[PDB]
């Protein structure tokens, strides 16, 4: 289609002339952007693709889950810390982790139990992803299908490829946005949507340039 | 034949040279066989690293010259309000604004947004022209356009061309190392490079780097 093939939209648009030979257009999200030469080998390129897709999916989940508590708090739902980068310290509070301020819900108190459960379950699922498990065997490391395609949206090749491209694009957007979350948390010290509100209030004054003069190395 | 090329070229470890990578055959400028991480084994990645090195070297040369000249002029007497290289972006936020050479009849910029937008547009255009075609000629080599950017014809004779390539990569690697030094000194010492040099010249025994190792 438009995305797959020699004539595909490139990351530099009309300014792209040096298209890497190994980047031909047979994989999703192939804009021909490889200037560091870090995916020249076919095996290294496959490993990089796998890393990219896993990172993309995790970034999508993280972006949605970092701002969902923010939106719920803005509506009026009570939390312990709505902000994502202090949402993890409420396990140490006397009331535990309420999960939407509901003591009848998870109501966890021991971070050790959370850590152990996460280690066991994530190890299991990670290992299944690498080698196969209950939800089918491993054929494509990043496009298993079957038990992870219950709605069967990836039935014909054309829709499956277009959905590949759409997935990778939303995922790259999410990864960019999560890098933004991290940097903004580091510098501003306030939640993402709170920074959005500050920017909307006084865009000229409340912006990133306001914090340019905070890391001056006086010594 | 150029003494800087071939298999008889000097090594990065000098007399202590041992094993040299096969792909490093000296056919490119600035080759000393320094690849211990195997980060340029493949020819394509080697070429990409070459363009990255040349661009980084040129940018570092510009950066070092622009970090030295303003504060040297300040030493001469041309006051700027904030002369040190890392204390140079805050001039815009001041009431007077960013004044070139400390004079109001120069650029006299006061809004960071305008500088950012104009620079974004212009740098995008020029960087696109760097890889694709553009007014100043088309693409012949990724990092050596040719006579379009060589108006004095220093590349006319191939031997002097290769010698100039070697000299360029030399001066540029020196500039990159100096720029890393600038960054580390600013982070650690917190003072300008010329003032650091003056402090070292004053009492080098005590006013050296080991003094600031106390954390």
């Amino acid at each position: 289609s438009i995305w797959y093939g020699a004539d595909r939209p490139k990351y530099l648009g009309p300014f792209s002339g040096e298209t890497p030979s190994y980047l031909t257009g047979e994989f999703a999200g192939d804009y021909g952007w490889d200037t560091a030469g870090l995916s020249s080998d076919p095996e290294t390129f496959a490993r990089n693709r796998e890393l990219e897709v896993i990172h993309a999916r995790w970034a999508m989940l993280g972006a949605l889950g970092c701002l969902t508590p923010e939106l719920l708090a803005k509506s009026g739902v009570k939390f312990g810390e709505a902000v994502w980068f202090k949402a993890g310290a409420q396990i140490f509070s006397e009331g535990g982790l309420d999960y939407l301020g509901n003591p009848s819900l998870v109501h966890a108190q021991s971070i050790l139990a959370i850590w152990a459960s996460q280690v066991v379950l994530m190890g299991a699922v990670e290992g299944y992803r690498v080698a196969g498990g209950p939800l089918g065997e491993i054929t494509d490391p990043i496009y298993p299908g079957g038990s992870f395609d219950p709605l069967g949206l990836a039935d014909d090749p054309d829709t499956f490829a277009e959905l590949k491209v759409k997935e990778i694009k939303n995922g790259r957007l999410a990864m960019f946005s999560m890098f933004g979350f991290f940097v903004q948390a580091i510098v501003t010290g306030k939640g993402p949507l709170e920074n959005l509100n500050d920017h909307l209030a006084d865009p000229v004054a409340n912006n990133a340039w306001a914090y340019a003069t905070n890391f001056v190395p006086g010594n | 034949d150029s003494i800087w090329y071939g298999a008889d070229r000097p090594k990065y470890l000098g007399p202590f040279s041992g094993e040299t990578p096969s792909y490093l055959t000296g056919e490119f400028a600035g080759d000393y066989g320094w690849d211990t991480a195997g980060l340029s084994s493949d020819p394509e990645t080697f070429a990409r690293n070459r363009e990255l090195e040349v661009i980084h070297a040129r940018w570092a040369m510009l950066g070092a010259l622009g970090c030295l000249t303003p504060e040297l002029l300040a030493k001469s007497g041309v006051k700027f309000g904030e002369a040190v290289w890392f204390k140079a972006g805050a001039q815009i936020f001041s009431e007077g604004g960013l004044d070139y050479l400390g004079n109001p009849s120069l650029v006299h910029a006061q809004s960071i947004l305008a500088i950012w937008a104009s620079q974004v547009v212009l740098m995008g255009a020029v960087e696109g022209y760097r890889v694709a075609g553009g007014p100043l000629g088309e693409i012949t080599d990724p990092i050596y356009p040719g006579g379009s950017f060589d108006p004095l014809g220093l590349a006319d004779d191939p031997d002097t061309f290769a010698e100039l390539k070697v000299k360029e990569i030399k001066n540029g690697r020196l500039a990159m190392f100096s720029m890393f030094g600038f960054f580390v000194q600013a982070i650690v010492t917190g003072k300008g490079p010329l003032e650091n040099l003056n402090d070292h010249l004053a009492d080098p025994v005590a006013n050296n780097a080991w003094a600031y190792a106390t954390n």
């Binding site: 000229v204 | 809004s111 960071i112």
Partner: protein
């Protein structure tokens, strides 16, 4: 033959056949099939004229009250900037011949009688020269051009003998409306970043050009 900054396609669909044709389509919304074939190809030129036509009235109407009150032909009580004239009550509401909610209904009624007829000339040319409307339906028949009806009422003064005169007067009017659209957009945005009317902004700029420009205002 005169052209302006044009993309690759541009000339493919745009050509020197309609008034004011210059080929500028960065995004190419006028693509015949392309992306944008849902809108009728005759719609975009027609809408472009009309939005510009109203822009002439708006750009010549938002600034007349202030200037005419400064040179002096109108009492200063009613000489107010356009955003204090009742369009934005919370920024300003000046009492008028009637309350603004009745003026709106009188507006919508009169505009409707003048706008529905225009609509169905475009859809069905010459359809308004059939039914009796106070006897003035013979004039309102149109020349077949939705954008340029023509007639003893809408062309009462009658400029333009041959097609040579019209083919350039149309170019003039689309271009005089070109500035009018930008002028109103200036009115809007130049008003949001300020609190006071357009005319004095020109006077402030004419007073201290190096102190009241866009860069100095806010940031």
């Amino acid at each position: 033959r005169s052209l302006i900054f044009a993309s690759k396609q541009s000339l493919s669909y745009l050509d020197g056949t309609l008034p004011g044709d210059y080929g500028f389509d960065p995004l190419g919304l006028m693509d015949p099939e392309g992306a944008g074939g849902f809108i009728d190809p005759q719609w975009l030129p027609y809408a472009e004229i009309i939005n510009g036509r109203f822009a002439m009235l708006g750009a010549a109407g938002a600034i007349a009250p202030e200037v005419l009150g400064r040179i002096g032909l109108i009492p200063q009580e009613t000489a107010i900037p356009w955003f204090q004239s009742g369009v934005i009550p919370p920024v300003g509401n000046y009492s008028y011949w009637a309350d603004p909610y009745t003026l709106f209904v009188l507006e919508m009624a009169l505009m409707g009688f003048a706008e529905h007829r225009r609509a169905q000339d475009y859809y069905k040319p010459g359809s308004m020269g059939k039914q009796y409307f106070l006897g003035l339906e013979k004039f309102l028949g149109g020349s077949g051009n939705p954008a340029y009806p023509g007639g003893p009422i809408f062309n009462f003064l009658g400029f333009g003998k041959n097609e040579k005169e019209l083919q350039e007067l149309k170019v003039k009017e689309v271009k005089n409306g070109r500035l009018a659209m930008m002028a109103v957009l200036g009115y809007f945005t130049q008003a949001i970043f300020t609190g006071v009317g357009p005319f004095q902004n020109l006077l402030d700029h004419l007073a201290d050009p190096v102190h009241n420009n866009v860069l100095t205002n806010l940031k």
